[PDB]
Amino acid sequence: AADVAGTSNRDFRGREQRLYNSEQYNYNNSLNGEVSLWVYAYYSDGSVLVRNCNSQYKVGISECFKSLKEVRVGQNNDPYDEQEVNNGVYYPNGGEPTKFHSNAKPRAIQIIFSPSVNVHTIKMAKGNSVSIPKDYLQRSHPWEATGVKYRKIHVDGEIVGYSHYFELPHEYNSISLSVSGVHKNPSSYNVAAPHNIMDVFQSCDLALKFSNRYWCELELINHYISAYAYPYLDINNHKYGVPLNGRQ
Amino acid sequence: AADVAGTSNRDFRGREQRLYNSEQYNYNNSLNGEVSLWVYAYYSDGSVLVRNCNSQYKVGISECFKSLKEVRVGQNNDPYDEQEVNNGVYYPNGGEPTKFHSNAKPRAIQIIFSPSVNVHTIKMAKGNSVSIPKDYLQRSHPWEATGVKYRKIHVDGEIVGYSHYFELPHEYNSISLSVSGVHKNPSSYNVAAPHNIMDVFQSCDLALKFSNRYWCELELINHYISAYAYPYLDINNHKYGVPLNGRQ
Amino acid sequence: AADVAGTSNRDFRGREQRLYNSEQYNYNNSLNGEVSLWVYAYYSDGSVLVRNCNSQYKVGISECFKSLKEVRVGQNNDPYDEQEVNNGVYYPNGGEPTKFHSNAKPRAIQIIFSPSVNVHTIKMAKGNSVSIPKDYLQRSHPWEATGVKYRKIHVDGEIVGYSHYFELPHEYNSISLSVSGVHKNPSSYNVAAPHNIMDVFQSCDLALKFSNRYWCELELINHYISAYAYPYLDINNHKYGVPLNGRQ
Ligand SMILES: Nc1nc2c(ncn2[C@@H]2O[C@H](COP(=O)(O)OP(=O)(O)OP(=O)(O)O)[C@@H](O)[C@H]2O)c(=O)[nH]1
Ligand SMILES: Nc1nc2c(ncn2[C@@H]2O[C@H](COP(=O)(O)OP(=O)(O)OP(=O)(O)O)[C@@H](O)[C@H]2O)c(=O)[nH]1
Ligand SMILES: Nc1nc2c(ncn2[C@@H]2O[C@H](COP(=O)(O)OP(=O)(O)OP(=O)(O)O)[C@@H](O)[C@H]2O)c(=O)[nH]1
Ligand SMILES: Nc1ncnc2c1ncn2[C@@H]1O[C@H](COP(=O)(O)OP(=O)(O)OP(=O)(O)O)[C@@H](O)[C@H]1O
Ligand SMILES: Nc1ncnc2c1ncn2[C@@H]1O[C@H](COP(=O)(O)OP(=O)(O)OP(=O)(O)O)[C@@H](O)[C@H]1O
Ligand SMILES: Nc1ncnc2c1ncn2[C@@H]1O[C@H](COP(=O)(O)OP(=O)(O)OP(=O)(O)O)[C@@H](O)[C@H]1O
Ligand SMILES: [Cl-]
Ligand SMILES: [Cl-]
Ligand SMILES: [Cl-]
Ligand SMILES: [Mg+2]
Ligand SMILES: [Mg+2]
Ligand SMILES: [Mg+2]
């Protein structure tokens, strides 16, 4: 006759559950694991474009002014008029659109990394509308190291991810955007030294990308974030994610 | 008076032909040569999307669920309805398309490598519809090493390429897909060690890509495969390619 | 009472201006600086597609036959007919378009690098319409080193950039195109050796891209080149750029 559940050190079902969750958390943090990046572009109509990349060793996303704009697939997007918006945004008075402010422009950006990133390695190039980091190429460092600004997304006392959020509320907030982060490596084994370097090149090939525009934050939270155990931070500063280490 | 053709060791025209073919085969296998990857997505209407990349040192292709779907350029693709298909495939009951199964979904994938690949280096991430390799990121190795499954495409006793083929016949066969392979290097000279590493970075830049949807396998065989001396394996297990080493 | 402007060595405003310009020029040339690449595709209707990438350490652009073709956003591009053009260009007599020559085909290409490139590192793969560098993969070196052909764009005796220009005036000038260059590094410190290699991988992530089709060379010169202090060479061999080193 077996011990009774939840009363002794022989609840092996319980120990196996805790190990299963701990193994996933720590595997993700091993050099064999993913590091993941999400870039969220929020539009005035309440919809949200997500750009996601999942890869070994390091991960990144690179967007231009045009690629960040809202596209409603299979609906009217006034493509000619929006090309004229682009011309008017690349150079002042450079186009002839029928509008002052395109509602396809993002109102905000949230950058989220998986908990397997090392925040000290995070780099971002938030450039102008023609993809220069700081106004002119000749004065541009090709990135800023913005890790100190990333907030921890905590759930149940566990870091389930990292967030950097900035609004684009002003008419001159017209941007291009690239972001990069490196997977944790507390060892002194360089994953990109000659013993393993070609595998890092293969990781550039193997990185999986995902993009979709969700009709609102609720839908994103329900059918993307929660569905796939991703970290998130909503407009009301509510934290989402699944804590795993040492937990049932 | 010259020797008679095909009767002696002084048929220099004959020797030059054989060397020409041998030189092409072996150049392709040198570190100076191409390694090439083709991903074929087969649709129920009989058409075939090819994605090709040709590059030095290593090569790869990365696709998401959406990018693998059939697009008939300049014809009706019901873009709104197919966006709803995507929503319904990213999460169950997540959309409202007018169909149960999109005929734009691939029925099968064939992955073919040039004979200059080392099959031991082949990696594939066959992920789910939101670009996670194995259901959740926390448990995902970012690839599987599938080389042992690649079949040799033989012609005249020569390996003209390698094939891995899998059908997607079930309703739940909704995938994302990345593939990578490394060019043969039997030497102990690491092409990505510091003496040559920046050239491997340049190869990422220089890799040439090609995509097209052919109306059927016959057309692909005739105007793509055969036209450009590529390897192929058709649905009837017939092998295509041009044998070169030691041959006239 | 301060010295009079432009009469002595105590015009600190003057010295600061000259240093400001010199600092930008030399920063651009430091390993911290950008290296930039522009590929210009010129169309018969006088418009010009620019593809630009700006990145640390090294930079590149890769295009196929299709991606180089003129696309007039929000206007009629006869997409079905132009897909048939593609089929007819990938293989002779392979399509059924309503035209002999597509006016969407580029008439010329100009490749321009920032002055921070090392011309000895420049590589180009000018391939055929199906993205093979030299007719067949088996005989293809994956690039040509074309630096000796690049012309210096001089302004006021300063090199503000480098240009390689080739026309595509013949019916058989149907190409694919990739180009790559490496940022100057006169030091013996290898930026891609293990001490800094992962940063070069991050630079692949962080590279910012830009594309736009301008209606004519005048507009490109005015609202792109000149607006953002880029180098250029127009059809009349007129040089554009801003000289900076040692200059007010
Ligand atoms: N830790 C703790 N949790 C409480 C307390 N009161 C209510 N709770 C709830 O209980 C949850 C934690 O329960 P457990 O996971 O079983 O307890 P634990 O502290 O993690 O201990 P172990 O999992 O056995 O290591 C919390 O998420 C709370 O919502 C309390 O006093 N202490
Ligand atoms: N090898 C071989 N080929 C045959 C034979 N009978 C018919 N053939 C045909 O001949 C072809 C090969 O001819 P060759 O290439 O001239 O002969 P080989 O064996 O390759 O000899 P070398 O090219 O001179 O080294 C094959 O593809 C067959 O289709 C036979 O008995 N032996
Ligand atoms: N150098 C030079 N410039 C001239 C001369 N005559 C007219 N110019 C104009 O003057 C410009 C250069 O003027 P400066 O920049 O003040 O002279 P500089 O030779 O560069 O000398 P510093 O800037 O003081 O080092 C040129 O771009 C010319 O258009 C001349 O004889 N010599
Ligand atoms: N009432 C409680 N008393 C004592 N410990 C608690 C209580 N509730 C939770 N904890 C414990 O405190 C730790 C942190 O959990 P907590 O719920 O505060 O994290 P959180 O979700 O980041 O909190 P919040 O989001 O509310 O700021 C966990 O180990 C948890 O078990
Ligand atoms: N009738 C034959 N007798 C002897 N050798 C042959 C004959 N036909 C071909 N060969 C030789 O056998 C070797 C293998 O050629 P073979 O035609 O069997 O390759 P294959 O195209 O892979 O065959 P298959 O596709 O029919 O399985 C070659 O060196 C070829 O010259
Ligand atoms: N009339 C002049 N007499 C002497 N030096 C000059 C004169 N005009 C310019 N320079 C100097 O000559 C150097 C080269 O300037 P220059 O204007 O010839 O360059 P550039 O723009 O490449 O010429 P161009 O485009 O006309 O061939 C600069 O240092 C400049 O100060
Ligand atoms: Cl590890
Ligand atoms: Cl070699
Ligand atoms: Cl430096
Ligand atoms: Mg607990
Ligand atoms: Mg023979
Ligand atoms: Mg001067």
- What subunits touch chain B, counting only 3 or more CB pairs under 8 A? A, C
A246 CB less than 6 Å from ligand 4? no
Q: Where are the alpha helices (DSSP H) in chain A?
A: 12-29, 79-90, 197-206, 217-220
Task: Using alpha carbons, list the distances in angstroms from residue B88 to A230, B95, B108, B127, B181.
Answer: 19, 4, 20, 17, 33
User: Does C203 contact A at CB distance below 8 Å?
Assistant: yes
Give the other-Cβ count within 10 Å of A50's Cβ: 20
DSSP code for C4: P
CA-nearest residue to B33 within chain C is C141
Residue to probe by mutation, ligand 4, list A156, A236, A245, A247, most atoms within 8 Å of CB? A156
Q: How far apart are CA A90 and CA A84, in angstroms?
A: 10
Q: How far apart are CA A87 and CA C128, in angstroms?
A: 32
Atom of ligand 5 nearest to the CA of B158: 22
Query: Is residue A56 within 8 Å of A34, Cβ to Cβ?
Result: yes
Residue ranges for the known binding site of C for Mg(2+) are: 96
Domain count, chain C: 1
Domain hosting residue C235, numbered range: 1-248
Pocket around ligand 5 at a 6 A CB cut-off: B 154-157, 239
> β-strand C239-240 against C232-233: which pairing, if any?
antiparallel
Give all strands (DSSP E) within chain B, no chain letters: 34-42, 48-56, 58-63, 108-113, 117-127, 151-155, 158-167, 176-183, 208-214, 232-233, 239-240
The technique by which this structure was obtained is X-ray
Please name the residues between 78 and 117 in chain A that touch chain B, using a CB distance below 8 Å: 114
Contacts of A148 (CB under 8 A, 6+ apart): A119
Phi, psi torsion values for C163, nearest 5 degrees: -125, 135
**Residues of chain B contacting A223 with CB distance shorter than 8 Å:** 87, 90-91, 94
β-partners of residue A154 are A159
- The verdict on a CB contact (< 8 Å) between A201 and B58 is yes
User: Does A39 contact C at CB distance below 8 Å?
Assistant: no
Long-range CB contacts for residues A188-195, cutoff 8 Å, separation at least 24: A189/A31, A190/C194, A190/C197, A190/C198, A191/A31, A191/A57, A191/C198, A192/A57, A192/C194, A192/C197, A192/C198, A192/C201, A193/C194, A193/C197, A194/B190, A194/B192, A194/B193, A194/B194, A194/C194
User: Does C119 contact B at CB distance below 8 Å?
Assistant: no
- The verdict on a CB contact (< 8 Å) between A133 and C73 is no
> What spacing in Å lies between the alpha carbon of B247 and ligand 2's midpoint?
10
**Residues of chain C contacting A61 with CB distance shorter than 8 Å:** 205
Q: How far apart are CA B143 and CA B213, in angstroms?
A: 27
- The verdict on a CB contact (< 8 Å) between B59 and A205 is yes
Task: Using alpha carbons, list the distances in angstroms from residue A186 to A34, A118, A137, A182.
Answer: 15, 9, 35, 12
User: Does B141 contact C at CB distance below 8 Å?
Assistant: no
> What spacing in Å lies between the alpha carbon of A29 and ligand 8's midpoint?
38
Q: Cβ-count burial of C42 within 10 angstroms (0-12 exposed, 13-18 middle, 19+ buried)?
A: buried
CA B176 to chain centre: 15
Please name the residues between 180 and 199 in chain B that touch chain C, using a CB distance below 8 Å: 194, 197-198
DSSP secondary structure of A88-142: HHHSTT----S-SS-TTS-SEEEEEE-TTEEEEEEEEEEE-TTS-TTSSGGG--S
Spatial CA neighbour of C77 closest among A97, B211, A79? A79
